[PDB]
Design a protein around this ligand. Structure first.
Ligand SMILES: [Zn+2]
Ligand SMILES: [Zn+2]
Ligand SMILES: [Zn+2]
Ligand SMILES: [Zn+2]
Lengths: 194, 194, 194, 194
DNA sequence: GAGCATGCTCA
DNA sequence: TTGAGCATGCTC
DNA sequence: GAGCATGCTCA
DNA sequence: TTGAGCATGCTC
């Protein structure tokens, strides 16, 4: 979760460099290791490895509340959006994180913790690339009443083999909001105190 | 829609300068009540003559703008599912009457609009009006509900058979800070009055 | 159509006076007898009569292209909007004009000319009012490709008795567009040449 | 997605300064073709070695932005129903090949994407490239279709079995005035180049 | 709402 | 047949 | 994007 | 319990 290890494959995440039109809907903050994005907008997250993972490897994405006081609560879409008609025909209505660009994502709910997660097969970079890109979408604002309700979350991306064993793990905070650029500057300026 | 009828029926609101004003404050220039969610709002019933025996008072909410007037005013998805019920009011109803052991919560079979009805009671000896306490269970801003759309509360005096005897109305804004918001709307309004 | 007669009841239309927030979505131009409005926005049209119409009277609204070269073509929604999911559960998908605020409008298609029209019962003004208001909605922009395709239209409002006989008739041009205020000024300034 | 393969495959476009430029003009700095609706666009196929016998060339359109990349690119509701068919191309297809009596119009059974395939033909004696003429049947602005969303045309060289031999691509903007629009996008682009 | 984005009209 | 200028929805 | 619109945090 | 100021989606 909060702990990130590269494992035997040197796994870790990367984010889009600044200076692109995508920045308006999705912008990453290095000093805060936090992604600021708008609701239902595709966010390109990069997967970096120093060695090819075993055949059949998978990449899972899960959201957990950052504050230890809310860590046990399952992150889910608020009552309103869970009922909106925005389903892609693949993602369940209550899931916050969706993968865009994949015909066969696996949307899971842990039988014990009841946490939602989405899994897609691991794919190596395109020829001439040092990373693989997976586009994610967050279907609720961090402010949504009855949902995240202004509570910040962390997205945990874990590399696992075909059997479900962890091969690597990385994470980043996320704020789904109306104005990513504005809100990112705010938190960064506020951060400039130490 | 505002007629006093044969009984001089019209509404009244408590004058300013009371601790209650913080949670509920009426604006004469805008004929608009500003109140907090779930807080009791005292509305006064005034008549020039005693209504026929068995008369009733109905409260109903409708969106003020013709653009949304046909949409039934109801609580948003989140609050409907909160456990704030009083054991009398249906979960979807926005307006609840406080202090009455026997209110009637109705849904019109044709328009599907919600309304609450209580018996008409004469003023207490020494008073010139009757007070009914209402509570609004969603903010005007609630996503998936009123969603920032202003509403009007329509109070009608009816005989035992359901015939209208009189009708009055006022705009309502349920919000976190009634005082602040009332001033804001009044100042804007006054920005044309001088 | 183009000819307007008040009949034995002095029937004629009236429009909302300027200086209201509604003006942004719906604004009438007197010198051009033209209504500029946005798509799917409620337009309050006033019905004026000097005498009470016979019991069972009806008010019909129909759209016809203004140019004699297109007069024979039936005005309908373009291919795209006819398939959008904006139906109110009462109006057929191809109809341009819809009535808002009525539970029982009659949406018709002339068996011979195939022209669409919507009919609602005539209702007298509210007490203290000199006119009756009917809210209409136009479901396509005048510019819609494959629909009105930049061709201006006329809305014909006719008062008819219970049997379908004409009692009165009035009309006005309409431009459904993105910016009513902007476009109204444009045509008015252009009109200022004579 | 751009690799020349073992046959040095890549695309070429006619140089500027031809009457054709008015209906079809390529922009080197933006690797973007600007063309009018239904106008033939000559695309050049270049290879350094003769492809295996039975090779084919496929053309497919995809939305450039990851936000819309999964949505199948197709003609809008209006043009699909226009009677501009050539008796070969399905009504919903955006890209049509001109000058070939036997093109194959396909729809992938899984992604449902449209594509058109024609046999690979060697350059005419004396030429260093092969020309294929394509037509785009909707403007990039068509409502209910591309709806102002930029697209990419992907041309792939494949052997007789369907295996990719090479692949290249270019952005496309179908519009009313290619020259004007090309300059506009280039000037903006140049507003960072100096 | 402004300004940008874009098909259509006019000579 | 071709822009130039007018006409018009969309971005923020 | 700016500025307005509004619930929540803090003392 | 109450604003003041901060936090944030929506209007145009
Ligand atoms: Zn939500
Ligand atoms: Zn609510
Ligand atoms: Zn249309
Ligand atoms: Zn089209």
């Amino acid at each position: 979760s909060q702990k990130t290890y590269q494992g035997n494959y040197g796994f870790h995440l990367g984010f889009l460099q600044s200076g692109t039109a995508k920045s308006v809907m999705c912008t990453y903050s290095p000093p805060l290791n936090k992604l600021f994005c708008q609701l239902a907008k595709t966010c390109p997250v990069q997967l970096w490895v120093s060695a090819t993972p075993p055949a059949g490897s998978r990449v899972r994405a899960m959201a957990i509340y950052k504050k230890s006081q809310h860590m046990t609560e399952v992150v889910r879409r608020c009552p309103h959006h869970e009922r909106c008609s925005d389903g892609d025909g693949l993602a369940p209505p209550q899931h916050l994180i969706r993968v865009e660009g994949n015909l066969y994502p696996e949307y899971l709910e842990d039988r014990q913790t009841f946490r939602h997660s989405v899994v897609v097969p691991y794919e190596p970079p395109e020829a001439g690339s040092e990373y693989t890109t997976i586009h994610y979408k967050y279907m609720c604002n961090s402010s949504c009443m009855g949902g995240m309700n202004r509570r910040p979350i962390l997205t945990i991306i874990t590399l696992e083999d075909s059997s479900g064993n962890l091969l690597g793990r990385d994470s980043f905070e996320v704020r789904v909001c109306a104005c990513p650029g504005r809100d990112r500057r705010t938190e960064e300026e506020n951060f400039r105190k130490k």
